[PDB]
Amino acid sequence: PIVQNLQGQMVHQCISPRTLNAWVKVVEEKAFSPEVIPMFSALSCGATPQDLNTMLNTVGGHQAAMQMLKETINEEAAEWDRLHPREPRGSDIAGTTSTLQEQIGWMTHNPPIPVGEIYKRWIILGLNKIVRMYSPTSILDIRQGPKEPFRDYVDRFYKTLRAEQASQEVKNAATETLLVQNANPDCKTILKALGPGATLEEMMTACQG
Amino acid sequence: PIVQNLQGQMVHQCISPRTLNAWVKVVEEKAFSPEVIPMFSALSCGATPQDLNTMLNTVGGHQAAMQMLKETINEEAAEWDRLHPQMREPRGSDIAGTTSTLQEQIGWMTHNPPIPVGEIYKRWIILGLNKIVRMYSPTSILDIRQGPKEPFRDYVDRFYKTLRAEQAATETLLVQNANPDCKTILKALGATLEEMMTACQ
Amino acid sequence: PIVQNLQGQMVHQCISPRTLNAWVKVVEEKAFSPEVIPMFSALSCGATPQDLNTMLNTVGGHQAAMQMLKETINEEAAEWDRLHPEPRGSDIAGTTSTLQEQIGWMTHNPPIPVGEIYKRWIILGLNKIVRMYSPTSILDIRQGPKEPFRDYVDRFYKTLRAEQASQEVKNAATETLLVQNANPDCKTILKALGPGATLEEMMTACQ
Amino acid sequence: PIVQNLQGQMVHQCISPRTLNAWVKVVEEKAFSPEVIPMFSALSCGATPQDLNTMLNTVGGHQAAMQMLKETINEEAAEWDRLHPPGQMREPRGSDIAGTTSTLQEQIGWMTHNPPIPVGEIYKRWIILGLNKIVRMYSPTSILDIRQGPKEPFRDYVDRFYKTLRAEQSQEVKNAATETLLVQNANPDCKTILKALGPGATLEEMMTACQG
Amino acid sequence: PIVQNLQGQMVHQCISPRTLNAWVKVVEEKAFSPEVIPMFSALSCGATPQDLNTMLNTVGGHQAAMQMLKETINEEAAEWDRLHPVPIAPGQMREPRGSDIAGTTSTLQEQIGWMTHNPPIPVGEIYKRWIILGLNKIVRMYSPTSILDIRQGPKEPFRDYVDRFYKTLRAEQAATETLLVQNANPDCKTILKALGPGATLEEMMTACQ
Amino acid sequence: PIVQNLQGQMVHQCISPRTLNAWVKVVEEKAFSPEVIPMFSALSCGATPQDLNTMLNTVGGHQAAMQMLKETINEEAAEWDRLHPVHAGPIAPGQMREPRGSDIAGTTSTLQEQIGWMTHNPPIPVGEIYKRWIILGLNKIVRMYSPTSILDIRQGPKEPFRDYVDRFYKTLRAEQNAATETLLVQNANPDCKTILKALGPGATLEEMMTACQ
Amino acid sequence: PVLFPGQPFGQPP
Amino acid sequence: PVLFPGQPFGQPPL
Amino acid sequence: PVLFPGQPFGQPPL
Amino acid sequence: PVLFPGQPFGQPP
Amino acid sequence: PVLFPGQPFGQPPL
Amino acid sequence: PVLFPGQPFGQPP
Ligand SMILES: O=P(O)(O)O[C@H]1[C@H](OP(=O)(O)O)[C@@H](OP(=O)(O)O)[C@H](OP(=O)(O)O)[C@@H](OP(=O)(O)O)[C@H]1OP(=O)(O)O
Ligand SMILES: O=P(O)(O)O[C@H]1[C@H](OP(=O)(O)O)[C@@H](OP(=O)(O)O)[C@H](OP(=O)(O)O)[C@@H](OP(=O)(O)O)[C@H]1OP(=O)(O)O
Ligand SMILES: [Cl-]
């Protein structure tokens, strides 16, 4: 990454063994669960394009995913070249045609051209695609069931809702109709007695017995 | 977070890898037991709002709680705009980090005098987490009674652990619900907890 | 905590994820055994009142112990207000004091160690807790017929550590109870060694 | 390695215990899976030739691969020498880059000179070159053998495909293989869909098209 | 400890969580085996007397050893007092009494003063020297086996025997010139004699493989 | 060790608890396997004689090896003394005294004396000299403890060539030379042997291993 | 509302 | 009293 | 394309 | 008598 | 050849 | 001899 030293200057720093290991392990354990994406974003804090490429290249497996990721980077870089005419071109941001000190050049400049943050944005978009494609369950399939505590059901609902990353209007429509509608009989009746506009904690307290 | 360098200047630093991991691990291990809250507050020392959002977003699971959290953050932010409508003061969403950039957040926090949007946002989150701890408390305090063979220590542990999650009335109730043989010894004191616990050891 | 940087000036630092879990794991692994106190003191090196409160609040369970600790803090602070009619007891305990008020007092010249003062109170309550949880009396430590003298001395001073009196009682214990409650094989050698014998000599004599 | 300090000057530093251990564990846990190469390169960020040898020498086991590595370093050094013959500084012979003939001081000198001779980065390029040979040889499957099971989920097959393709690695066979081999070796029901999409279908479009 | 910073002055630094746990684990896992002593000495590199007392005090158990240790500190401290009698000139620091080196009667600031003074009054290294002297006595009281009881078993490999020999010899703390050869296997013993006096241990050990 | 700080002065710093543990574990985990030597050398990067002595002294067990280690140090120190007769007498102001063999080994030198030599201008690398003695002795130890002879590594009838080549160059490393490319083909599977001879001499190891894949 | 149901923390509008 | 039962250490008053 | 199928991230072309 | 039996290390009398 | 079979990486010659 | 059998490395004689 590029971090700040004691003289106030941005200097290049080697990617640490800690960060390399944390990203490998988080992928090994949580595959493309949604929370892997914000972990990547934090683990790549200050990353140069080279570092991002290191992190992606350290992934063993998931090559279908990694290939889709390459195709998004392709999509986004070709779109960058359409919108931009020494300024970095799309392949430079992705680190195929830029050197480390060229990347350091763009990023430690005033004003900076954040090729790292730009590349990262591309990567997050592809990772977000993988999370939705690898989403195991659809929201219309989350039903509480006779013995499931309402909390555990609400957990399954918003977990599924997060992975499918649908539009905000559709998410609202999912909470507004499908969440209460697919609750077991014991709780659905208690929630109707509360009436419209009940907050989630009001619903969850109401169905703890 | 924002830490200070060699001079009096406050500088932005990336969130630490230990921090990122300790926060995710603490949530996996202790779920929403009360001691997670100060653990969060300490792990988020010097945090910017982005940092707080990263920490929250890294949580896999507990999405019911995490939605409750968004609802509490929304409540506190609208509350902020009702009391706060040189530098441009931040709107509620600026504090929660949705409409403010990291450099904007760095601006408020490294100003003199600073506008501590990180510490304010943390206040909101801590308020939401404490709501969650109350909800996940399985038992109410009006239900913990000393067993006849149960040592008064194990009972007090169970008592104040339950009281902490539920967040004079405790002084009345604790001694009143002790087992009958310790109950008279504690009633005879008429007094510090230390004196009560030795009285029933 | 307030640590020294590389320019020679006391600056505030965040409590590290490592100090925090170090403290949480010592409490989880040790139910207020005597050695937890010196660990706490070391883990709270340079701590501010805020930090001390952070360390305590991370303790899950042991709420009986924590509740006793609060009452000791109450009393120690309540006594501070009488001796002092500026930091009030509630400020040292961090309930009414800000971090910046705390940082100010601690980096003052002359320093006002509100961290060390609060710690002094916390350590005092913790010592109350180890005594309450001390399982054995010193009078119950007697050397077994087949118990090696080393293991008995281990039991003796381990117990003496938790049942902490004042060194008058601790020395009255040592100069009588240790030699008196040894098994009669080793016990007669102890008188033959003579009363002034050192612990090392006594142990070699019963090896 | 040679890193930049906190006052801005390029300084030599000891290899850290964390890095030493990281390299040992990844070679132990992952032998020569393709991804060990980026882990090595990143763990040796800023490495001097001495440092690279230390990392290699710490590997206990995999001595067949290490011997192949020695032979690739050999070929690259013999190739370096056959390509390179005031107060002008002594250019490194191949053995200098590899750290056998050169001292640490000599290595630092080439690397922090104006203009620098990055013998560390050069030695690394050779080692990475030998490691890539090792990954290729230890690849369990050839790309031509990979076929989608009659009941195998498409996504698992695409995983096996590009995992096999990555270890095979130069570029000629791979771009055409993705174009032809993936659609061609799909099970009879997914293949005829994939052909119906046509050329210029993305992998994303292909994976939803065979998701069931 | 007292470390050197970046502007070259000796400054006090808190004992780290890692050093603290490292010392506690070494006592737990290896009790008073001979090699815990150099581990202690290294874990207390740069320690102030206060630091050493922390390290000793975090030990749970071994209270026989811990008391044996306190008694050694007494003898060494009284010996300091009998040999270094103890107002103060402006430039100077007050003189350290035996109890001051042990940290019972000195403040941390007095210790930092003595150690960061020029010329330094190394109250930490002196205190350590006392503690290590007490630790060495504990190691030899707890040594289970005498050097005269190590004899090579008939089926026992000669290395395993030399291991046992120098391991026990280490714990007791010359008398081993011919003690090693004399107490060797009948078959190896003559082979060692055929090498003659003055064979190296490498020569002796290769000879009895 | 002695490291270079933010102000570029060679300064002494304590051996870290991570390094201490790392060295203890490596010896526990891998005893005197050949890879332990470079692991030690890297763990003592910048070491003082004191640091080396600490690391060696922290080893619990292996006392036969440690004693051979001492005898190697003795031999190496005596030759240093015979080649470096220190000019005993008053030393000149602003100069260090000359280091004897025991001074390099850290037995008669103080920590400050070691730092003086190592941070001298030009340095007297007593840390590096001791490490050379110690690594010399450690290499003698690795040879003696190698369990298998090179002459005993023969390719199993169902053993993959790769695993056999592994076992070969691994045991080859412990003993420490022309017999390599000859013996390797000679002890291969009867299947693989006729393939390697059919390749002809001058083959690279890569070329042989693919042939018996 | 600063955060709509199901959106990540810090997500821009 | 600085600290009330069941309230956290360092909890502000009122 | 900046990245070709089956070649590493950051791999320079030709 | 810098330390008395049973008193912790460094304890001020 | 810079590296010989069975000798460690970086091993000096002669 | 700098080191005697059974005394630690760096041990002053
Ligand atoms: O001994 P601990 O205090 O419980 O800490 C360990 C230690 O990490 P650190 O040395 O950085 O403190 C482990 O490393 P080793 O001692 O085995 O070398 C590490 O394992 P990794 O190196 O594989 O990360 C493990 O982490 P984990 O539980 O993820 O396996 C981590 O524990 P903590 O993260 O809980 O401190
Ligand atoms: O945060 P600290 O407790 O002060 O420890 C740090 C930390 O090491 P750990 O994470 O293992 O505790 C640094 O690592 P990073 O946070 O930068 O990943 C490490 O730096 P290196 O990884 O570059 O070695 C540094 O070591 P150093 O002071 O030699 O630079 C070390 O400090 P300590 O060794 O004093 O604990
Ligand atoms: Cl160095």
Numbering used by the authors:
A (entry chain A): 1 to 85, 97 to 220
B (entry chain B): 1 to 85, 95 to 176, 184 to 206, 209 to 219
C (entry chain C): 1 to 85, 98 to 219
D (entry chain F): 1 to 85, 93 to 176, 178 to 220
E (entry chain D): 1 to 86, 90 to 176, 184 to 219
F (entry chain E): 1 to 176, 183 to 219
G (entry chain N), J (entry chain P), L (entry chain Q): 313 to 325
H (entry chain O), I (entry chain M), K (entry chain R): 313 to 326
What does the paper behind this entry write?
The cellular proteins cleavage and polyadenylation specificity factor 6 (CPSF6), nucleoporin NUP153 and SEC24C contribute to early steps of HIV-1 replication. These proteins engage with the outer shell of the HIV-1 core, which is composed of the capsid protein (CA) arranged into large hexameric lattices as well as into 12 pentamers needed to form the closed conical structure. NUP153 and CPSF6 mediate nuclear import of viral cores. Prior X-ray structures have revealed that short phenylalanine-glycine (FG)-containing peptides of CPSF6, NUP153 and SEC24C bind to CA hexamers in the hydrophobic cavity created by two adjoining CA subunits.
FG peptides bound to CA hexamer complexes were generated based on the X-ray crystal structure of the CA hexamer+ IP6 + CPSF6313–327 complex and placed onto adjoining CA hexamers in accordance with the cryo-EM maps. The 15-mer FG peptide directly binds in the hydrophobic CA pocket in agreement with prior and current biochemical and X-ray crystallography data. These protections are shown in the context of our X-ray structure of CAhex + IP6 + CPSF6313-327.
